[PDB]
Enzyme design. Structure first.
Site, PDB file in Angstrom:
ATOM      1  N   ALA A 232       0.866  -0.978   0.083  1.00 12.75           N
ATOM      2  CA  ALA A 232      -0.055  -0.049   0.274  1.00 12.75           C
ATOM      3  C   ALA A 232       0.959   1.296   0.013  1.00 12.75           C
ATOM      4  O   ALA A 232       0.567   2.179  -0.839  1.00 12.75           O
ATOM      5  CB  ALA A 232      -0.983   0.121   1.198  1.00 12.75           C
ATOM      6  N   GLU A 235       2.280   1.689  -3.607  1.00 12.94           N
ATOM      7  CA  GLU A 235       1.477   1.469  -4.742  1.00 12.94           C
ATOM      8  C   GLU A 235       0.316   2.451  -5.123  1.00 12.94           C
ATOM      9  O   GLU A 235       0.227   2.853  -6.134  1.00 12.94           O
ATOM     10  CB  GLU A 235       0.916  -0.009  -4.800  1.00 12.94           C
ATOM     11  CG  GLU A 235       1.748  -1.199  -4.979  1.00 12.94           C
ATOM     12  CD  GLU A 235       1.955  -1.409  -6.499  1.00 12.94           C
ATOM     13  OE1 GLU A 235       1.564  -0.714  -7.270  1.00 12.94           O
ATOM     14  OE2 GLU A 235       2.397  -2.520  -6.644  1.00 12.94           O
ATOM     15  N   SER A 237       0.323   5.873  -3.576  1.00 15.04           N
ATOM     16  CA  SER A 237       0.797   7.155  -3.976  1.00 15.04           C
ATOM     17  C   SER A 237       1.648   7.130  -5.401  1.00 15.04           C
ATOM     18  O   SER A 237       1.349   8.198  -5.943  1.00 15.04           O
ATOM     19  CB  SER A 237       1.695   7.460  -2.926  1.00 15.04           C
ATOM     20  OG  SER A 237       1.078   7.501  -1.618  1.00 15.04           O
ATOM     21  N   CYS A 344      -8.198   3.850   5.213  1.00 12.75           N
ATOM     22  CA  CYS A 344      -6.994   3.629   5.117  1.00 12.75           C
ATOM     23  C   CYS A 344      -6.270   4.667   6.019  1.00 12.75           C
ATOM     24  O   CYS A 344      -6.482   5.710   6.521  1.00 12.75           O
ATOM     25  CB  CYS A 344      -6.595   4.070   3.694  1.00 12.75           C
ATOM     26  SG  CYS A 344      -5.270   3.031   2.827  1.00 12.75           S
TER      27      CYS A 344
HETATM   28  C1  HEM Z   1      -3.513   8.402  -2.424  1.00 11.39           C
HETATM   29  C2  HEM Z   1      -3.150   7.415  -1.233  1.00 11.39           C
HETATM   30  C3  HEM Z   1      -4.315   6.748  -0.714  1.00 11.39           C
HETATM   31  C4  HEM Z   1      -5.469   6.237  -1.286  1.00 11.39           C
HETATM   32  C5  HEM Z   1      -6.556   6.979  -2.325  1.00 11.39           C
HETATM   33  C6  HEM Z   1      -5.786   5.045  -0.627  1.00 11.39           C
HETATM   34  C7  HEM Z   1      -7.011   4.372  -0.602  1.00 11.39           C
HETATM   35  C8  HEM Z   1      -7.498   3.393   0.188  1.00 11.39           C
HETATM   36  C9  HEM Z   1      -8.718   2.990   0.384  1.00 11.39           C
HETATM   37  C10 HEM Z   1      -9.990   3.427  -0.275  1.00 11.39           C
HETATM   38  C11 HEM Z   1      -8.833   2.176   1.366  1.00 11.39           C
HETATM   39  C12 HEM Z   1     -10.057   1.139   1.862  1.00 11.39           C
HETATM   40  C13 HEM Z   1     -10.157  -0.161   1.548  1.00 11.39           C
HETATM   41  C14 HEM Z   1     -11.451  -1.045   2.304  1.00 11.39           C
HETATM   42  O1  HEM Z   1     -12.051  -0.681   3.329  1.00 11.39           O
HETATM   43  O2  HEM Z   1     -12.209  -1.735   1.529  1.00 11.39           O
HETATM   44  C15 HEM Z   1      -7.600   1.808   1.956  1.00 11.39           C
HETATM   45  C16 HEM Z   1      -7.046   0.935   2.815  1.00 11.39           C
HETATM   46  C17 HEM Z   1      -5.678   0.933   3.452  1.00 11.39           C
HETATM   47  N1  HEM Z   1      -4.820   1.746   3.032  1.00 11.39           N
HETATM   48 FE1  HEM Z   1      -4.936   2.963   1.700  1.00 11.39          FE
HETATM   49  N2  HEM Z   1      -4.936   4.700   0.417  1.00 11.39           N
HETATM   50  C18 HEM Z   1      -3.873   5.460  -0.080  1.00 11.39           C
HETATM   51  C19 HEM Z   1      -2.442   5.504   0.931  1.00 11.39           C
HETATM   52  C20 HEM Z   1      -2.189   4.718   1.575  1.00 11.39           C
HETATM   53  C21 HEM Z   1      -0.770   4.448   2.248  1.00 11.39           C
HETATM   54  C22 HEM Z   1       0.363   5.576   2.109  1.00 11.39           C
HETATM   55  C23 HEM Z   1      -0.876   3.219   2.978  1.00 11.39           C
HETATM   56  C24 HEM Z   1       0.537   2.938   3.703  1.00 11.39           C
HETATM   57  C25 HEM Z   1       1.344   3.618   4.378  1.00 11.39           C
HETATM   58  C26 HEM Z   1      -2.121   2.736   2.826  1.00 11.39           C
HETATM   59  C27 HEM Z   1      -2.080   1.541   3.695  1.00 11.39           C
HETATM   60  C28 HEM Z   1      -3.675   1.130   3.616  1.00 11.39           C
HETATM   61  C29 HEM Z   1      -4.069   0.148   4.415  1.00 11.39           C
HETATM   62  C30 HEM Z   1      -3.394  -0.610   5.190  1.00 11.39           C
HETATM   63  C31 HEM Z   1      -5.465  -0.107   4.306  1.00 11.39           C
HETATM   64  C32 HEM Z   1      -6.326  -1.178   4.892  1.00 11.39           C
HETATM   65  C33 HEM Z   1      -6.191  -1.292   6.292  1.00 11.39           C
HETATM   66  C34 HEM Z   1      -7.447  -1.786   7.051  1.00 11.39           C
HETATM   67  O3  HEM Z   1      -8.007  -2.902   6.432  1.00 11.39           O
HETATM   68  O4  HEM Z   1      -8.046  -1.258   7.921  1.00 11.39           O
HETATM   69  N3  HEM Z   1      -2.622   3.431   1.956  1.00 11.39           N
HETATM   70  N4  HEM Z   1      -6.812   2.876   1.107  1.00 11.39           N
HETATM   71  C1  LIG Z   2     -10.368  -5.304  -4.518  1.00  6.38           C
HETATM   72  C2  LIG Z   2      -9.571  -4.079  -4.389  1.00  6.38           C
HETATM   73  C3  LIG Z   2      -8.823  -3.897  -3.153  1.00  6.38           C
HETATM   74  O1  LIG Z   2      -7.873  -4.777  -3.421  1.00  6.38           O
HETATM   75  C4  LIG Z   2      -7.408  -5.975  -2.328  1.00  6.38           C
HETATM   76  O2  LIG Z   2      -8.485  -6.056  -1.726  1.00  6.38           O
HETATM   77  C5  LIG Z   2      -6.212  -6.706  -2.301  1.00  6.38           C
HETATM   78  C6  LIG Z   2      -6.475  -8.141  -2.559  1.00  6.38           C
HETATM   79  C7  LIG Z   2      -5.328  -6.474  -1.043  1.00  6.38           C
HETATM   80  O3  LIG Z   2      -5.033  -7.684  -0.559  1.00  6.38           O
HETATM   81  C8  LIG Z   2      -4.007  -5.382  -1.220  1.00  6.38           C
HETATM   82  C9  LIG Z   2      -3.068  -6.136  -2.150  1.00  6.38           C
HETATM   83  C10 LIG Z   2      -3.617  -5.031   0.166  1.00  6.38           C
HETATM   84  O4  LIG Z   2      -2.266  -4.913   0.307  1.00  6.38           O
HETATM   85  C11 LIG Z   2      -4.309  -3.547   0.496  1.00  6.38           C
HETATM   86  C12 LIG Z   2      -4.241  -3.468   2.024  1.00  6.38           C
HETATM   87  C13 LIG Z   2      -3.529  -2.407  -0.265  1.00  6.38           C
HETATM   88  C14 LIG Z   2      -4.367  -0.861   0.029  1.00  6.38           C
HETATM   89  C15 LIG Z   2      -4.054   0.213  -0.785  1.00  6.38           C
HETATM   90  C16 LIG Z   2      -6.030  -1.213   0.002  1.00  6.38           C
HETATM   91  O5  LIG Z   2      -6.692  -1.597   1.028  1.00  6.38           O
HETATM   92  C17 LIG Z   2      -6.591  -1.095  -1.225  1.00  6.38           C
HETATM   93  C18 LIG Z   2      -7.391   0.258  -1.679  1.00  6.38           C
HETATM   94  C19 LIG Z   2      -7.425  -2.405  -1.728  1.00  6.38           C
HETATM   95  O6  LIG Z   2      -8.377  -2.571  -0.676  1.00  6.38           O
HETATM   96  C20 LIG Z   2      -8.093  -2.638  -3.147  1.00  6.38           C
HETATM   97  C21 LIG Z   2      -7.419  -1.927  -4.524  1.00  6.38           C
END
Ligand code: HEM
Ligand SMILES: CC[C@H]1OC(=O)[C@H](C)[C@@H](O)[C@H](C)[C@@H](O)[C@@H](C)C[C@@H](C)C(=O)[C@H](C)[C@@H](O)[C@H]1C
Length: 395
Positions: A232, A235, A237, A344
């Site tokens: 994440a 990928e 950013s 996120c």
């Molecule tokens: C422009 C930047 C980013 C966007 C638009 C973005 C978008 C998202 C979205 C939409 C989700 C929700 C997935 C769901 O609940 O179904 C998510 C989850 C997540 N993002 Fe990002 N993200 C960004 C940057 C980052 C960065 C910089 C990190 C880590 C350093 C990160 C780590 C994660 C993680 C770990 C989750 C899942 C956490 C959980 O399951 O509670 N993301 N992101």
């Molecule tokens: C179905 C679309 C989603 O992908 C998935 O669920 C993937 C199988 C996850 O295992 C990925 C590889 C994880 O590493 C995420 C934590 C990355 C983080 C950026 C997000 O949450 C992301 C927004 C993600 O939820 C969506 C792209």
């Protein structure tokens, strides 16, 4: 019988017009996802999106079953954060969440601003024209997450390759991806293991302490957090820098409007976050554990749901002129960063990075323009997210 989702192969950052139709006349429609069995409700509107994402009656853990519809080849890893339900999910996020608070992330603006400048210095050494991806989009987020996590910067090609495969949609097969997951888990497990008697001042260090000091959390979960943060952490950013820059330069007016007022950048970042479908289609699936009322339908217990974040971000009931891209929106309650328990964790980091990249560019390169044609632009295909493989720009 029921329509195949995704509705089409994606093109650029453009939305399938069927989402708008669905929002208006069938906001909760049934679909057939590319993997798993049976059927899921597609949620296209913001009001419902928040219920699927926000409500405790929806379980992501329940979607770990191979038989559940999902958007990707592999059955979801049970140990991943996306598949944990609270309170276990809460504990897991607590492990690492301290470092991602608005306040701590703000502490990094200085390291991040230098890093951006250094990488833009190396871009000017080369001279125009140059690949913005090569020079900025890849190396900047990669450095930041590597220094944050404590991951060897020399391993970029290694983890980029791995990370690209795990974010596969149509491109790779289940076995190819399942292969990569085990390698990646082993890589990460080896990385945290290096701190058994060499504890570090970084996330991987904190992760290593937790593995030898925790009873609630398994080692699988703790290690998988490291791989989730690393995938994440770059990928999102990396692609998102190219996406904003694409949107800016395709209609030069937007880029021009930011050169006029560089204080707009933060609001424009929030706008372009709303506008851009970074997640190409769908989302991690939520299974109802009890009956739950949505706008048009009651989802029954055991019925899966999936959300399209971008469609909720084009909802005309919450955004005025939503199909139009506007940096002077008074309110902007988007869900580009999701919503609810799984919002996120890097939302503040992503924001910092996008602000700093866009600021630096808008200050320094007022004459920035796309030095390749829009038609030949190489968008990445068959991955769960969107973005450019290269962006040649001139100044
Ligand atoms: C422009 C930047 C980013 C966007 C638009 C973005 C978008 C998202 C979205 C939409 C989700 C929700 C997935 C769901 O609940 O179904 C998510 C989850 C997540 N993002 Fe990002 N993200 C960004 C940057 C980052 C960065 C910089 C990190 C880590 C350093 C990160 C780590 C994660 C993680 C770990 C989750 C899942 C956490 C959980 O399951 O509670 N993301 N992101
Ligand atoms: C179905 C679309 C989603 O992908 C998935 O669920 C993937 C199988 C996850 O295992 C990925 C590889 C994880 O590493 C995420 C934590 C990355 C983080 C950026 C997000 O949450 C992301 C927004 C993600 O939820 C969506 C792209």
């Amino acid at each position: 019988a029921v329509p195949a989702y995704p509705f089409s192969l994606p093109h650029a950052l453009d939305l399938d017009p069927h989402y708008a139709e669905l929002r208006r006349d069938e906001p909760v429609s049934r679909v057939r996802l590319p993997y798993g069995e049976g059927t899921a409700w597609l949620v296209t509107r913001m009001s419902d999106a928040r219920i699927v994402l926000g409500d405790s009656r929806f379980s992501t853990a329940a979607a770990t079953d191979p038989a559940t519809p999902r958007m990707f080849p592999t059955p979801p890893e049970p140990d991943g954060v996306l598949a944990q339900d609270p309170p276990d999910h809460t504990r897991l996020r607590r492990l690492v969440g301290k470092a991602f608070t608005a306040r701590r992330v703000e502490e990094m603006r200085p390291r991040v601003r230098s890093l951006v400048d250094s990488l833009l210095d190396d871009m000017v050494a080369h001279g125009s024209p140059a690949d913005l991806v090569e020079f900025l989009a890849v190396p900047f987020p990669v450095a930041v997450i590597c220094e944050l996590l404590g991951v060897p910067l020399e391993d970029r090609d290694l983890f980029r390759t791995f990370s690209d495969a795990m974010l596969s949609s149509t491109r790779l097969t289940a076995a190819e991806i399942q292969r990569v997951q085990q390698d990646f888990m082993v890589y990460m497990d080896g990385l945290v293991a290096q701190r058994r008697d060499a504890p570090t001042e970084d996330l991987l260090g904190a992760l290593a302490l937790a593995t030898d000091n925790d009873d609630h959390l398994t080692k699988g979960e703790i290690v998988n957090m490291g791989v989730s943060l690393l995938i994440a952490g770059h990928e999102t950013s990396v692609n998102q820098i190219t996406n904003l820059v694409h949107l800016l330069l395709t209609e030069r007016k937007r880029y021009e409007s930011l050169v006029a007022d560089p204080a707009l950048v933060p609001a424009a970042v929030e706008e372009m976050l709303r506008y851009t479908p970074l997640v190409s289609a769908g989302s991690f699936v939520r299974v109802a554990t009890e009956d739950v009322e949505l706008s048009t339908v009651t989802v029954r217990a055991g019925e899966p749901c999936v959300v399209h974040f971008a469609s909720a971000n084009r909802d005309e009931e919450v955004f005025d002129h939503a199909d139009e891209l506007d940096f002077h929106r008074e309110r902007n309650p988007h869900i580009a960063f999701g919503h609810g328990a799984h919002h996120c964790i890097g939302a503040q980091l992503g924001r910092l990075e996008l602000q700093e990249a866009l600021s630096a560019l808008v200050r320094r390169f007022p004459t920035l323009d796309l030095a390749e044609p829009v038609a030949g632009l190489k968008w990445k295909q068959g991955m769960l997210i969107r973005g450019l493989e290269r962006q040649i720009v001139s100044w």
